Design a protein around this ligand. Structure first.
Ligand SMILES: [Cl-]
Ligand SMILES: [Cl-]
Ligand SMILES: [Cl-]
Ligand SMILES: [Cl-]
Ligand SMILES: [Cl-]
Ligand SMILES: [Cl-]
Ligand SMILES: [Cl-]
Ligand SMILES: [Cl-]
Ligand SMILES: [Cl-]
Ligand SMILES: [Cl-]
Ligand SMILES: [Cl-]
Ligand SMILES: [Cl-]
Ligand SMILES: [Cl-]
Ligand SMILES: [Cl-]
Ligand SMILES: [Cl-]
Ligand SMILES: [Cl-]
Ligand SMILES: [Cl-]
Ligand SMILES: [Cl-]
Ligand SMILES: [Cl-]
Ligand SMILES: [Cl-]
Ligand SMILES: [Cl-]
Ligand SMILES: [Cl-]
Ligand SMILES: [Cl-]
Ligand SMILES: [Cl-]
Ligand SMILES: [Cl-]
Ligand SMILES: [Cl-]
Ligand SMILES: [Cl-]
Ligand SMILES: [Cl-]
Ligand SMILES: [Cl-]
Ligand SMILES: [Cl-]
Ligand SMILES: [Cl-]
Ligand SMILES: [Cl-]
Lengths: 411, 412, 410, 411
């Protein structure tokens, strides 16, 4: 007597009869067999289906060029609002096609967690690129998580469930592997220290001027000015008033304009929620909202320096050996002498830590003085965290997948 | 790998449960019935589709009650509160949760008729079919047409075959029946037990037990000085009319019977239930006793000095007593003329006279010893063909087979 | 949540999960709403979708000319093997498109029973042309039906369920009307005595020579020769040997070749199982096989006489007032004095009964004499069965449909 | 024809029936529970979730036994065979068919703790909640955080709130508790009954019944010439170690207490059940008596000349006797320093001294009368604020309200 089949049937009958939107899900759970799997079908999703971006984008673009005869499926929250190059067909999350796609594909490629109601058969290969060298503690390494609806243990039980389905897990650096192996409950075998595919352009194209010039004129940037990128992490604290009118960025734009307006334009990469509350009138041709731009790596390439605080992008951008400033206005509130980070944040990062934005501005005045004054520290950072990206990472995965699926076209 | 048969049952059950269908109990049963539900020491009995406590299953039960008390006995009825069973046995109602339990758990099914096809007989269970009499009329595979409503002949036979293929043992009264059963029921001879009917054991063991004869006689308030005629005509479709409120008095003419025999004889009328409760025996009290609703027909045989029937299978059971029999076949013309829709040659080798009218019949009944003498030959011949098999040990043979069957189950 | 829907709902989960082919149907049963009806969609199917032919063909061809702007859908067993003129799109039986079409259509037009799993809603108009004046008892009027799998009462129950859905039933004559009212449990209110649309050409085209010539040279017929058509009904009796080699026709082609070979050509219209068993080597240009020809009416037009036995076609061919012959060779088998026929076969049919071929051949020698000898009976036949055909049947229907769907557009 | 909520139950019951889930008795009860099921004179008692025959429910029931013998009284237990109930009541085992009939049929429920959210309190029933005592620790709504396994703070509170919404009447021992209940349990003062606790009736009515004081004392084999000290420390996670095989002897130092207090005292130790079965009181017979398993804690008070405790709701019950109390809070520092995780001002308005070391406690214990006088001032304050609301009639009040309710329902 098959007792799990019985439960899925009940559940599915309950869904059909009540007209629940998950009827499509329960049908998939009932009927999902190892035999639906067709070896030349590949699904990609990035950030839970929100973009066409990141390592899955670059993995997919590489494969479109060298292996065009496989079936490619992209998964999207809203497929109609996402443009995808090449032969790939797109599926809407939780649609019948979503589930066919995952039931059928021999390889899943993602950069974040994919849902546990999806079945990763012994027959399929789930490759997790993940999404950056960690700074804040994550997964198993966390202490508390007062996240509504779920306890710390149940949140970790679930995370561990998901990481066990990871067949391969890409890695950028020894430091990260040491961390992943613990945080994600990983077997080092499954880890591939080959760098992030999304960071291929940062090596392969860092000098292609024709290419830097399409990115710049696609953003309408001034020809005479250098580019400062500012990418603060999301903060819960600073949300108030429906989010209708925020208090001008802590970084003081009026001041930056007075200081830097002659030599610089600043790209602001905020959380989407801050992005549509920002009034940038008075700052046109100096402050450029850029939150809603598909490819952040392209933004790095055209950036002469980077301002952030507690973000993983600092490791990505470090590949370019350009200066970085850490405007950490709220560093006090963050646990004083916080080890809530895997690295020693007070000591070995590539640039100056500023708690106020006014000395930051002055420092920025002359970029080259920073570049020498921190070349010692920059190179060091490059050596720990970036000395592994080849620019061949998309290739490596792409080839692995191809190689993987030749095996399956025999026995 | 997906279990499709299970899936189908789950849907069928969900349907019944949600729709508030009476058959929910059945589908719950179908869905869960494991081979591991069977308890070797449990045994179900049913007779005639759960109408009675009677017939051969009754007598198998009563024997095992005596020599094998520690087993679990279940009896199945349509209406259990209206049936009385001696002994340790419990009773379940048909189509009830307890009914399906019982048939699920039982290592042995005992009955005398078809049991439904919605019951599942596992490789785990032994189904003993005693059936219910030496055939006169063609049955099952041997019939030519069955214009029975809703159903064709092929499909009626297809279903009967489905049933008999579940019969682990089939009881047989005589070589004649074994020949027929082998054909009509698609039976392997290996499975036939030629041992006579457990219900006919009393016909051998007790024909001379005067005290027992007397309970039966007194239970029926029979006058003492009076000999006993049993009349048992088969049912006839033709003769049903008027919602069945008032029937035309019996062809056999009771008024005439009373005039000719009302002094020496009493006559027991074993009719079909629909005639029985339409009969008006006003004016024949102490001469014509209705006995249709009497629970044990063999007891009626024991106190019967002769039988009058027509086209029944009882003529075969009553034949063990070697007493006189009369066949009042008034409608024999209508029954196909020179008909072989009977297994035996009805026109030659029965133990008595055929009478198309009831008046010659009565004159004959006047002198019973002359009839006995007149036909002894034809009687002894009928006895040798159809009744020379009953040891009166049929009830015993079956109980000892069950008992032996379940011992070897309980060890292993 | 309604019980009838829960029932359909469960059956479809069954089909979807079990991959039953009937999933298309259970889906259709679920979403079949009265609102799906587009008042200007019309479906046509003839003989259960084997053909593009018969009375539906003609109602269709008429509407194509005078009502081009409607959605015409034709339904077939194998659409890729059927050629349909005009604006009609075609669908396969039991496909999603099949159920769409039938759900959406404001009008069903066919000449045979269409299946009970299709829902004819209050909203739609089912026009039944049926397929000919009966000679054999049908439906309610059959005494017994020992047909495999089903019982006589259950068979009539299902036929009754189908006829109760026919909003209009066509009728060729008063005799047919009388029989339909009983055999099909029909109200006279619902019968249209107007004649078969398939018969339109028999009245309108019988003197069209350019048309008779197309039909003739398409069949590759000799030119100086007159045409006999032979159409025997099928007999279970005569099927043997898997059907590989049959016994040559009781009509005796050799004899007919000897006797008529110089004056006539003869068209054999046989049951499809006999057609692919017939060897006609030795008779090229004398005996042509015409069993697969799509349009039987045209074969009548170019026929100078009809030889049949027990067929509803005699009634059709009667419109032309030409000679007919009845080669009833097995007529003794058929129940001796059988009244399992509605009409008095032994008497009033339009030509002589022959039980042997050879007297039939002598007779065929001189047709004109036959026409004379039987003009009285041919006329009485024409009067009783064929004098209803205006030639306007296809028009009447197409116009009825047109009038019917002008109302719904409000 | 079929309603949605009944469909969902109908499906849950199918699951339990087919899968042989113990919970089938529950799903059936959920399907069949009708408002007509209720029998106006059936009454169910359960205390501390069925572990006991005890507390306010026992006493409400003992009253209603003497005065209303004609009603159907049902007691509910985890293990009914391990409990003895005086009177006509029939016992039922939790989660059995009988359990659910009992709660379905009863016109009135009586409990001193939370009854399960799966039981339906029909609009037909009256659920009287005695609760279990004047709080000192913040409870329910008023807790700040509860990192309790399997559940979150907001989820925990939602569930508590669902449960109190079902309380028709809530007993209260004092206005202090009323002010608190109103907030913590989301109550409406309409529903609060300030009658004092039933369990505390014998503290008033029998403080002098010498034949009754004597039965208790000889049930316990207590020495004749000796006075009684009771100690009742709350449970502390910290002190559990080693599977709980061998504990570290109590901080109070029994050896000392014996030397100092032996010639005049005997000490009743009422510990957690887990410490009780770990205590080796060998060499202390007739001095320290293990009293942890005694059914009726109120009897224990009656016979106590004083009470040593620490952070307990039982100080408020004992207060009724206007006898001395000591608070041996050895771990007071650990407990949040100046903790306001209490409702009252612990450092100030309790009816005795706070001791962090046991040696002064003992030297003080020496002369009761000296403490009774030195502290009368505070014992009387305590007794006005927390203990002045006890009639001795709480059981009668409750009993009489039930009776009154079920005369109406008898029309
Ligand atoms: Cl493939
Ligand atoms: Cl390829
Ligand atoms: Cl979309
Ligand atoms: Cl990360
Ligand atoms: Cl869970
Ligand atoms: Cl970003
Ligand atoms: Cl299932
Ligand atoms: Cl057993
Ligand atoms: Cl035994
Ligand atoms: Cl009953
Ligand atoms: Cl009984
Ligand atoms: Cl029989
Ligand atoms: Cl009579
Ligand atoms: Cl009988
Ligand atoms: Cl309904
Ligand atoms: Cl279906
Ligand atoms: Cl339309
Ligand atoms: Cl038009
Ligand atoms: Cl096709
Ligand atoms: Cl048809
Ligand atoms: Cl219909
Ligand atoms: Cl016809
Ligand atoms: Cl049918
Ligand atoms: Cl007529
Ligand atoms: Cl031939
Ligand atoms: Cl509802
Ligand atoms: Cl449950
Ligand atoms: Cl009551
Ligand atoms: Cl127990
Ligand atoms: Cl509730
Ligand atoms: Cl409390
Ligand atoms: Cl207060």
């Amino acid at each position: 007597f098959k007792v799990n089949q019985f439960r899925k049937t009940l559940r599915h009958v309950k869904n059909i009869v009540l007209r629940r939107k998950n009827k499509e899900r329960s049908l998939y759970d009932l009927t999902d067999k190892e035999d639906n799997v067709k070896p030349k079908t590949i699904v990609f999703e990035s950030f839970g289906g929100k973009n066409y971006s990141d390592s899955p984008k670059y993995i997919y673009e590489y494969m479109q060029k060298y292996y065009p005869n496989y079936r490619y499926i992209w998964s999207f929250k809203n497929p109609d609002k996402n443009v995808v190059p090449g032969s790939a067909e797109k599926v809407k999350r939780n649609s019948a096609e979503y589930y066919q796609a995952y039931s059928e594909a021999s390889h899943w490629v993602s950069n974040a967690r994919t849902p546990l109601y999806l079945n990763k058969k012994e027959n399929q290969t789930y490759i997790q690129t993940w999404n950056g060298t960690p700074l804040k503690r994550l997964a198993n390494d966390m202490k508390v998580v007062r996240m509504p609806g779920t306890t710390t243990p149940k949140y970790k039980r679930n995370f561990n469930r998901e990481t066990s389905r990871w067949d391969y897990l890409i890695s950028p650096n020894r430091y990260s592997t040491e961390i992943f192996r613990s945080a994600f409950w990983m077997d080092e075998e499954r880890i591939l220290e080959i760098g992030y595919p999304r960071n291929d352009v940062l090596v392969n194209r860092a000098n292609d001027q024709e290419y830097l010039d399409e990115i710049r004129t696609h953003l309408n940037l001034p020809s005479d000015k250098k580019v400062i990128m500012y990418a603060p992490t999301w903060r819960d604290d600073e949300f108030v008033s429906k989010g209708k009118y925020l208090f001008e960025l802590k970084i003081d734009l009026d001041n930056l304009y007075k200081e830097l307006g002659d030599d610089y334009v600043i790209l602001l990469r905020m959380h989407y929620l801050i992005s549509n509350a920002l009034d940038l009138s008075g700052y046109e041709n100096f402050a450029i909202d850029v939150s809603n731009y598909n490819d952040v790596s392209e933004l790095f390439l055209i950036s002469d320096c980077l301002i952030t605080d507690y973000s993983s992008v600092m490791f990505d951008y470090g590949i370019l050996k350009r200066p970085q400033f850490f405007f950490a206005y709220d560093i006090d509130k963050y646990d004083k002498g916080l080890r809530g980070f895997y690295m020693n944040y007070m000591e070995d990062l590539p640039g100056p830590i500023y708690t106020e934005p006014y000395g930051l501005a002055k420092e920025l005045k002359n970029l080259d003085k920073v570049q020498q004054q921190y070349q010692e520290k920059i190179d060091a950072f490059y050596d720990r965290f970036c000395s592994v990206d080849n620019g061949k990472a998309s290739q490596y995965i792409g080839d692995l997948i191809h190689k993987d699926i030749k095996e399956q076209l025999e026995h």
